[PDB]
Amino acid sequence: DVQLQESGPGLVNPSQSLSLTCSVTGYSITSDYYWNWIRQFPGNKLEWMGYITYDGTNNYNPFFKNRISITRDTSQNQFFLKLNSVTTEDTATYYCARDGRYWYFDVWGAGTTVTVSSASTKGPSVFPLAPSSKSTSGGTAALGCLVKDYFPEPVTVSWNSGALTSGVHTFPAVLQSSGLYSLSSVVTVPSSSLGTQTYICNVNHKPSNTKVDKKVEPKSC
Amino acid sequence: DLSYETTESGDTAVSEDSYDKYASQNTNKEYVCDFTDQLKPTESGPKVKKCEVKVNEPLIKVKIICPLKGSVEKLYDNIEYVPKKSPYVVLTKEETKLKEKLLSKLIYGLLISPTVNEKENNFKEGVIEFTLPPVVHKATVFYFICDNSKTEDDNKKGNRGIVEVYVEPYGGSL
Amino acid sequence: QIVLTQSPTLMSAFPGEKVTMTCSASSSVSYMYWYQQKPGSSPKPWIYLTSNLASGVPARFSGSGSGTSYSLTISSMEAEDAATYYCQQWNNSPPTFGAGTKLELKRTVAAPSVFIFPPSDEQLKSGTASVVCLLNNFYPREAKVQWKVDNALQSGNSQESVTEQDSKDSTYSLSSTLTLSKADYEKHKVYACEVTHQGLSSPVTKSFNRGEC
Amino acid sequence: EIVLTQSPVTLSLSPGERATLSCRASLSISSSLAWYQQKPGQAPRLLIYDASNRATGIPARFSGSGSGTDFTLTISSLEPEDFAVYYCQQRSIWPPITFGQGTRLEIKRTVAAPSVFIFPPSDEQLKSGTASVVCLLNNFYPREAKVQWKVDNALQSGNSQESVTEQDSKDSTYSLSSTLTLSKADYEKHKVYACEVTHQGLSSPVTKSFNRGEC
Amino acid sequence: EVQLVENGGGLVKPGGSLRLSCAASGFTISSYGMNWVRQAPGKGLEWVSSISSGSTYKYYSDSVKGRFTISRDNAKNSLYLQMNTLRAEDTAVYYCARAPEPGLTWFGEWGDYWGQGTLVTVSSASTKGPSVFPLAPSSKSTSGGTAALGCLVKDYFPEPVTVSWNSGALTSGVHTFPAVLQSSGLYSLSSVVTVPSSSLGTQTYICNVNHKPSNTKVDKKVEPKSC
């Protein structure tokens, strides 16, 4: 089994060059396969970008005109995507993939979101949401926390540092007019048992390198 | 990972560039060399029928038909298909000599079905067949040889058949 | 640039039901490839060489076609098979992809639970007031959310967000964020959230009073 | 060279009948045979290609068949426009590509006895220095007719050359011309010249005579 | 509509040379293999040569190779044959034929359309006009309307000729026999007509002959003799 990986430059401003690394383990990059890059536009089509062969030969998508390089470091089992002169349309989730047996894409990497904006990378704010009860509770309660003003996306949101694995409710990000992303995460609990677990809202922002942990405690309505 | 140092001249028969030369029968995306009748013995001297398969398109299927030993009474009693492992093993020209090469390392991406029809894709069953890939990077020419010259009936000797497959590059972007 | 036009753009099926998806190439291709992408994952490869299936794929899955017409048929729709399916050709370079056919699982039972969350006191100290309205465990995806401030409609100051389908129960969740400043928030007391949804018996109004509640 | 022999060499048949034509190959060619019609002094015309597929605009009565050595053109019900010479051709083992030698279709008629005419040389022909005496057979069926020249009741050979017309479109008969070529030094040294016609519609062989000079 | 027209045939003395052309009309030649077939007078058809599109593969008979060269202009829609060092064996009518593209297996509608024919005569005998001598019906004085008369065309080269009666007004009961080659190498034929025997005085008969080599037109009257 072959495993692929993609490196992590999440934000490039436009009119700059974009470089990405696909790291391979488990199989030698110079034996028998073709080594592709595929982008995925947001919730959208795939554009096959290119490959470098075992031999070193290059074959690129002709929509890109003498602006991309796919190269390789054989001693590190790595191949590299170099897209010059990026624009805001070039914002996409990028994947590397070993060739299929003949002319498809069998083994895929995990993928990397690269957002392209002429903006400053900012850290999130976490504001608590408590189970103050109103009518039609159902005999149960729900609590949560709000992430505001982070740039760029993604973040990883966990409850009690991963010691709460059941009930997966994290909302997708929305962009405000400021240009800063915002999302929220929720958990459902029984309403008579609010002081048993200590609900921690654990947020990691990997571009602005932010670690926020917030406790959620109930209110007096 | 199976090859040998066979050496073939391209013609062990005495004829040299007085070969009868022909192109394949290219219907739609199938280019066919059909040696069923042009190899059975007519004139007393063996002559050489060469079949040329020139390809510059993606996904051209190439089918080569050589007749088996004794599928008709008396006419093909001593046929030789070289390379025996073909379509997996082909011949390429090495300085006025023909030597075996692995086809899958030669053209990457080449589509070879294990059974040509229901029977195995080998000249043992009498037809070989392969489909050329969407991207071919360097121009490649390779050879298949099917020989009826050893066969003699009524003091007439059969003809010798060569397939030359010439692929021009396509798919390239550079 | 061979144009693969995948139809339908979206579909919803019951479990057990048979589903066929199509892909229309703009010219003659000799073989079609197919992939499944679940959200938050790689596109695993499902069909190669129009008929062959990559290992790790159930035998109910099928691919078929010729010419310009290709299709994917599932004989038994299951919960696991709910993802988006892409076609790909490589008849000639460059390999192109279709836009995808999004597949969903259909559950009649809807139990929406609406929970309301006021802005934090720390947020109000920051000069900001974002009010959160939450919709839980509901199906279908259509629900209209309206904000009212002392019985008055809001004209484009709220933005909402929809989750994807949960794998456990095939239900959804929705959030509505009202983003506000401080001076127009603390000059009103009573706030209300409006849920109009097809699975409700009456449209749910939920209120709170500022500061005291 | 694959040699293709075609039988029968001449076939006689009334219209509205089934007509089967046989093409035989030296060495079992693989059904590459074509079948052509040719009328007198005209371009050939393709009837059946690939031994069993008929050509576009060739009638449905023409049907090719066969395999290996033996191939067969079948014309299922004859018409007057079907009477012509026919050729098979192989392209299985080639170069060269080879033809048959031909098969005639005449029309079958009720038997017609020849009208026998003998013609003296002209006097201007005698003054040019050569002398041709002509025997004509008109409107007879079948094509086979024996003509003998007799000079003073004695058989002479090798001075004669003959030619036969095509079939008439409605009489379905033929005509025959036989020329006795001599010199004036050999012609003026004789008396009586005669034509002997042996034909099926004649009951005894018809002699037509000529006396020199006076008549 | 769809035509194949040859020109270029002729009488060349033996060992001579001659270029033959086939011009097509109504279809594109480029997707078609093109061929030449000859037919000597009184025998079947015999293949001369074949050429592929463009000219990548050209093929000849054994008797014409070395002497003859085949070629093609796709843009002019034309096929051409160059015939050198000619023999009297080469005397024939030469036809071109369209075919599907040649292969190891030439399976198709070969000879879908054929040319008109051109005549190539190879003999030493120089082109001579005919001599017309009448054959009179005076011996055929039999009652009941049975008379035959004619005129003899002798010692002309090369073929063809046209023999017409009353400048074209007598076509019925007329038999023109095929020409035959003499020991001299020239040609002879005769034309005969059956008329009613009562029409020998009042109706009079012209033998109009045109021999298109050397522009030879001779009209000769056919008159009865004394017995």
Residue numbers in the entry:
A (entry chain C): 1 to 35, 35A, 36 to 82, 82A, 82B, 82C, 83 to 100, 100A, ...
B (entry chain A): 561 to 734
C (entry chain B): 1 to 27, 29 to 214
D (entry chain E): 1 to 95, 95A, 96 to 214
E (entry chain D): 1 to 52, 52A, 53 to 82, 82A, 82B, 82C, 83 to 100, 100A, ...
The authors write:
Pfs230 is essential for Plasmodium falciparum transmission to mosquitoes and is the protein targeted by the most advanced malaria-transmission-blocking vaccine candidate.
Indeed, all three Fabs bound nearly identical discontinuous conformational epitopes on Pfs230 D1+, which comprise the following: residues from β strands 1 (amino acids 580–583), 2 (amino acid 585), 3 (amino acids 592–594), and 4 (amino acids 608, 611, and 612); loops 2 (amino acid 584), 4 (amino acids 595, 597, 598, 600–603, and 607), 6 (amino acids 632 and 635), and 12 (amino acids 716 and 719); and the disulfide bridge formed by C593-C611. 15C5 is a non-functional mAb occupying bin III and does not compete with mAbs that are in bins I or II. To further explore why some mAbs lack potent TRA, we determined the crystal structures of two additional antibody-antigen complexes, using Fabs derived from previously reported studies with recombinant Pfs230 immunogens. The first mAb, 15C5, did not recognize Pfs230 on the surface of female gametes and was previously described to lack detectable TRA at 375 μg/mL by SMFA. After generating Fabs, we determined the crystal structures of Fab 15C5 and Fab LMIV230-02 bound to Pfs230 D1+ at resolutions of 3.3 and 2.0 Å, respectively.
